[PDB]
Enzyme design. Structure first.
Site, PDB file in Angstrom:
ATOM      1  N   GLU A  35       0.817  -1.232   0.000  1.00 24.25           N
ATOM      2  CA  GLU A  35       0.000   0.000   0.000  1.00 24.25           C
ATOM      3  C   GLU A  35       0.840   1.267   0.000  1.00 24.25           C
ATOM      4  O   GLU A  35       0.551   2.222  -0.724  1.00 24.25           O
ATOM      5  CB  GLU A  35      -0.930   0.048   1.235  1.00 24.25           C
ATOM      6  CG  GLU A  35      -2.038  -0.989   1.233  1.00 24.25           C
ATOM      7  CD  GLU A  35      -3.067  -0.746   0.137  1.00 24.25           C
ATOM      8  OE1 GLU A  35      -2.966   0.242  -0.595  1.00 24.25           O
ATOM      9  OE2 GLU A  35      -3.951  -1.642  -0.011  1.00 24.25           O
ATOM     10  N   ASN A  46      -7.737   8.783  -5.671  1.00 25.42           N
ATOM     11  CA  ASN A  46      -8.566   7.800  -6.415  1.00 25.42           C
ATOM     12  C   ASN A  46      -9.365   8.442  -7.533  1.00 25.42           C
ATOM     13  O   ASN A  46      -9.597   9.659  -7.553  1.00 25.42           O
ATOM     14  CB  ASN A  46      -9.491   7.095  -5.411  1.00 25.42           C
ATOM     15  CG  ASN A  46      -8.690   6.437  -4.291  1.00 25.42           C
ATOM     16  OD1 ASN A  46      -9.005   6.581  -3.090  1.00 25.42           O
ATOM     17  ND2 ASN A  46      -7.643   5.731  -4.681  1.00 25.42           N
ATOM     18  N   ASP A  48     -12.453   8.387  -8.097  1.00 26.35           N
ATOM     19  CA  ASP A  48     -13.739   8.924  -7.626  1.00 26.35           C
ATOM     20  C   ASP A  48     -13.534  10.209  -6.824  1.00 26.35           C
ATOM     21  O   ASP A  48     -14.510  10.768  -6.331  1.00 26.35           O
ATOM     22  CB  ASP A  48     -14.496   7.896  -6.797  1.00 26.35           C
ATOM     23  CG  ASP A  48     -13.844   7.567  -5.439  1.00 26.35           C
ATOM     24  OD1 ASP A  48     -12.747   8.099  -5.065  1.00 26.35           O
ATOM     25  OD2 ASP A  48     -14.432   6.761  -4.687  1.00 26.35           O
ATOM     26  N   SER A  50     -11.803  10.554  -3.998  1.00 23.71           N
ATOM     27  CA  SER A  50     -11.386  10.330  -2.607  1.00 23.71           C
ATOM     28  C   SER A  50      -9.845  10.215  -2.658  1.00 23.71           C
ATOM     29  O   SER A  50      -9.256  10.139  -3.741  1.00 23.71           O
ATOM     30  CB  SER A  50     -12.037   9.073  -2.024  1.00 23.71           C
ATOM     31  OG  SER A  50     -11.578   7.938  -2.751  1.00 23.71           O
ATOM     32  N   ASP A  52      -6.403   8.216  -0.551  1.00 28.66           N
ATOM     33  CA  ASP A  52      -5.916   7.169   0.398  1.00 28.66           C
ATOM     34  C   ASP A  52      -4.704   7.726   1.170  1.00 28.66           C
ATOM     35  O   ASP A  52      -3.842   8.408   0.586  1.00 28.66           O
ATOM     36  CB  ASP A  52      -5.448   5.910  -0.315  1.00 28.66           C
ATOM     37  CG  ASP A  52      -6.521   5.223  -1.062  1.00 28.66           C
ATOM     38  OD1 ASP A  52      -7.707   5.370  -0.706  1.00 28.66           O
ATOM     39  OD2 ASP A  52      -6.170   4.565  -2.027  1.00 28.66           O
ATOM     40  N   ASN A  59      -8.970   5.270   3.113  1.00 29.56           N
ATOM     41  CA  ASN A  59      -9.608   6.144   2.148  1.00 29.56           C
ATOM     42  C   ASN A  59     -10.574   7.142   2.793  1.00 29.56           C
ATOM     43  O   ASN A  59     -11.229   6.846   3.804  1.00 29.56           O
ATOM     44  CB  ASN A  59     -10.326   5.241   1.147  1.00 29.56           C
ATOM     45  CG  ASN A  59     -10.921   5.971  -0.009  1.00 29.56           C
ATOM     46  OD1 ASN A  59     -12.119   6.248  -0.004  1.00 29.56           O
ATOM     47  ND2 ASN A  59     -10.120   6.254  -1.034  1.00 29.56           N
TER      48      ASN A  59
END
Ligand SMILES: [Cl-]
Ligand SMILES: [Cl-]
Ligand SMILES: [Cl-]
Ligand SMILES: [Cl-]
Ligand SMILES: [Cl-]
Ligand SMILES: [Cl-]
Ligand code: NA
Length: 129
Positions: A35, A46, A48, A50, A52, A59
């Site tokens: 990650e 991301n 969309d 959002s 992380d 998120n």
């Protein structure tokens, strides 16, 4: 902060992640490796909208507040910046809530795609724990 492998294993264990919801410590270390490469300051936007955050790339659509993710929640009740701290307490506590949410560690798609089913014990091999 960029953790060393065994250094992060030890911090995760100290914060109660070893076998939390049945996931051995190597699963958590493996997830953090893919990650964030063990970097607490990692961020990634991301598609969309959002973002992380932190060593486990938690998120903003569900888990933390960053002020710029419409329609989102903040189920861990933390600013997303807390997830970038050199102190992993906020990331660990929020990860405990995520892994309890129903789908276990499949919540982390990198864990499902790169860790699940593999020899995750290798990630803590050699470490003083
Ligand atoms: Cl490594
Ligand atoms: Cl393990
Ligand atoms: Cl927001
Ligand atoms: Cl906040
Ligand atoms: Cl820490
Ligand atoms: Cl599970
Ligand atoms: Na949010």
């Amino acid at each position: 902060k960029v953790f060393g492998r065994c250094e992060l294993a030890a911090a995760m264990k100290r914060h109660g992640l070893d076998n939390y919801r049945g996931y051995s410590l190597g699963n958590w270390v493996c997830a953090a490796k893919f990650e964030s490469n063990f970097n607490t300051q990692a961020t990634n936007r991301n598609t969309d909208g959002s973002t992380d955050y932190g060593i486990l790339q938690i998120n903003s659509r569900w888990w933390c507040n960053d002020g710029r993710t419409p329609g989102s929640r903040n189920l861990c009740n933390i600013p997303c910046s807390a997830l970038l701290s050199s102190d992993i307490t906020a990331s660990v506590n929020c990860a405990k809530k995520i892994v309890s949410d129903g789908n276990g560690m499949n919540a982390w798609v990198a864990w499902r795609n790169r860790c699940k089913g593999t020899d995750v014990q290798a990630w803590i091999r050699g470490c003083r724990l």
